[PDB]
């Protein structure tokens, strides 16, 4: 999250001199930011995923060989 | 008359008797067994190619 650090990093050093306070601004974006973006479920969900895929692909390569 | 007469020449000439109805039948009957014979097999490999359709129709719906 470069922004609250690049905010920080503002008003730590337009402390004393505040000649363009910037922090509403930088408030209001991370809000934004934290509004538009919305553990390892998804994870364990994409590696039950990846097997069924490999199950289904076995299960169709396992017909590959028929005569009559 | 005439056509009594030509439908007694032109009838069937044969089983009057015992013998030759009898060959005729027993010729039918060994045809008969050897058309059979020949039916069942290809029936057996027809029931055979189904039943081998059935089992991979039964793998394929067990995924």
Excluded: W
């Amino acid at each position: 999250f470069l922004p609250l650090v690049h905010n920080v990093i503002k008003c730590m050093d337009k402390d004393s001199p505040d000649l363009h306070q910037d922090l509403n601004a930088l408030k209001t974006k991370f809000q934004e930011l934290r509004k538009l973006i919305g553990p390892e479920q998804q994870q364990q969900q994409l590696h039950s995923l990846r097997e069924q895929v490999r199950t289904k692909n076995e299960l169709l390569q396992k017909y590959k060989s028929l005569c009559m | 008359a005439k056509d009594i007469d030509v439908l007694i020449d032109s009838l069937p000439s044969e089983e009057s008797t015992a013998a030759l109805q009898a060959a005729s039948l027993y010729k039918l009957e060994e045809e008969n067994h050897e058309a059979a014979t020949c039916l069942e097999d290809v029936v057996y490999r027809g029931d055979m190619l189904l039943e081998k359709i059935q089992s991979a129709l039964a793998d394929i719906a067990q995924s």
